[PDB]
Curated annotation (Swiss-Prot), chains A, B, C, D:
Its EC number is 1.1.1.-. It comes from the Eukaryota. CDD domains: TR_SDR_c (cd05329). Keywords: NADP, Oxidoreductase. Belongs to the short-chain dehydrogenases/reductases (SDR) family. SDR65C subfamily. It holds the Pfam family adh_short_C2. The active site is at residue 142. This is Tropinone reductase homolog At1g07440. NADP(+) binds at residues 12-36. GO terms for molecular function: oxidoreductase activity. Disulfide bonds: none annotated.
């Protein structure tokens, strides 16, 4: 019922034109939520937005390069004015002949910075919502990214709970049915029915055992 | 929709007259699921069953001492015949001047045995369901119990997946709104929408940080 | 130097005639420590004791069935009187057509009880030592055992630190050079040089990565 | 004996003039190891080097700004030529009105880059040693750093084992006797006696329990 309802909940999802982000927009839109998304390619955006309205989904978007400071500030200003200064959900969806050290550090930090900054640009809207929710949805490079994001997630959760802001991190499977099916866990975590769930770092992996001993991603 | 529907799903919940078990029966019954539960006290059972039918909940029960082998075998026989040899959900809900070694080992093992045996007595019904789901819902004594159950949970999940049987473990908060609110996570995990989620050991704790460093239950 | 010296440190090691226990006796004896061990087979004991004295190792032993209460009480009485009521180290080394529920619960609990009880029978000697050290050295059955012991280990460590008693758990590799080489980690953990190390649950596994993502035993 | 000997083992320790690094140089030098260290302040270096030679410690150093690419390349060239192209140990010791996003991402990534690059600049010397060893020794900012480094550590360990290169990460206590006492664990991990230990992420924390439930840093 009302506990499992996302109806009319305002959602900001970054990178909503593909992969997990697109699946997350669909999932939330399936629950009749109001979503704003973004993408660098204005053609793919309008392209996804079109297909969405033809499904009864209420989604708006903007051409933002989430890797740029002024872009993240503009995006959040566009979100506040359209949601009336209040934001219920924030889905920090990070984007995707061998990588060097500079590239390794550039990609891992850029991801963390973008995520850490967007969370700060959204705080006021989230806190004003009364039931704020944040979810960080994101080898070699990836793994180190995971470890980095899991910590930030749990750190924030241990810092904004009084403002009523919960934060959790979700990771796709490493071993398996689509990996994009994880969108339903993302949705549930943001439901009022999951208000007590915060600081969780969940990876929906197939998991495995050896001779009877468990083994899973870290 | 159908992905988040538990409608007409058959559920066996042990210890459903109190605490978490009672909350789990309510949660599943709220979703219009068909549940069978048990309890040693036939008065508390009929007492809970009465209040339930007056709420439109479809729950049946039996007086079982889940700590006794013949009782667990009788309980499962009562479940099969009433659900037609098929069982969708199994909620292994364990029950609750200082404890000695014998008592320490007696309580931790008794809990594990009961849970491990009930899972085996239910396998055929679960497998026959096509979408089997098991969830193990359960200081000093408790902690060691947790560690024990988490392993069994992940072990089974790494063993019955081919039969379509998923298994997860859920723990109540150590630090916080009722702890019984965790029933909604229990319900979601059993939904078709969460079919890809298995081998998870989740403790919905308030969590905490020190000087900025995270800290959570193990 | 003195920080990495185990010289004249009294050690109780259960099951010291084979596998890890025998390796642990050798390791500590290599550091010139005074050890007392036990075994059900009095022939294998005298057999190992003989070979040891011919190596300059100072080890004594007794025929104890560590699975029996009166045996554990007798063993510890034999240890106190020979070490003068003080014990520096305690190595809880647990011992090793498909297992049933009763056997599953009987083996996991028996292991935990024996370990939990021996730790209590040794407390006074450990505390009196001033620098007490305990290490719990121990599929399906095993994994659940691990989870159980890891918790007890960390629980005790969080309870006897004021008496100067540290406690850690060590597990052999699941995937690799002998697994018995872990005896050196066991020795180091008990050194004064490792006095600040407690509550650790270490499994020296070969570990592995998939497509770049880490994976290890739980 | 030889298994626990670090005698004549060549060691590169970054930031060896203070805190943990200085303690690590002392620990290894106590075992009569040959160490090369670095520091931005040439006065503090010569200052520490002086006090060291007056203790019989064999340590050399260079003024390197480990945060600069050309500096890390120069440092490693200075190490190879003095150790004859072979390096046994590599201790990646990272260095230390509220931080912003750019600073947050700049510090976490800079630390990871420096560590990831130094490991690559040392590989050939390590591999040529035959028994290569690497140890990464390193709120809010720190925690995320930890998560990042733990992953890289385990990733590398899962990549250079065939070359005989082991890698582990060690973290100081969050809650307690000096935190610099962890230098002995660092030394042990690099000993031949610990050749089978790799992929470990150890934090020597005091740990704690609540009502009997364990709780530790992640």
């Amino acid at each position: 019922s009302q506990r499992w309802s996302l109806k009319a909940k305002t959602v900001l999802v970054t990178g909503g034109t593909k992969g997990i982000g697109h699946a997350i927009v669909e999932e939330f839109a399936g629950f009749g939520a109001v979503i704003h998304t973004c993408a660098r390619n204005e053609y793919e955006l309008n392209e996804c937005l079109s297909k969405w309205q033809k499904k009864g989904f209420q989604v708006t978007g903007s051409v933002c390069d989430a890797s740029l400071r002024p872009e993240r500030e503009k995006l959040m200003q566009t979100v506040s004015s359209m949601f009336g200064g209040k934001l219920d959900i924030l889905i920090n969806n990070l984007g995707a002949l061998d990588y060097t050290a500079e590239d390794f550090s550039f990609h891992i930090s850029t991801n963390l910075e973008s995520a850490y900054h967007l969370s700060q640009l959204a705080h006021p809207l989230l806190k004003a919502s009364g039931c704020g929710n944040i979810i960080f949805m994101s080898g070699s490079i990836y793994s180190a990214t995971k470890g980095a994001l899991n910590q930030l997630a749990r750190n924030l959760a241990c810092e904004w709970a009084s403002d009523g802001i919960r934060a959790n991190a979700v990771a796709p499977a490493v071993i398996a049915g689509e990996p994009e099916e994880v969108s339903s866990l993302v949705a549930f975590l943001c439901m009022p029915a999951a208000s007590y769930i915060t600081g969780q770092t969940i990876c929906v992996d197939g998991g495995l055992t050896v001779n009877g001993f468990s083994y899973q991603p870290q």
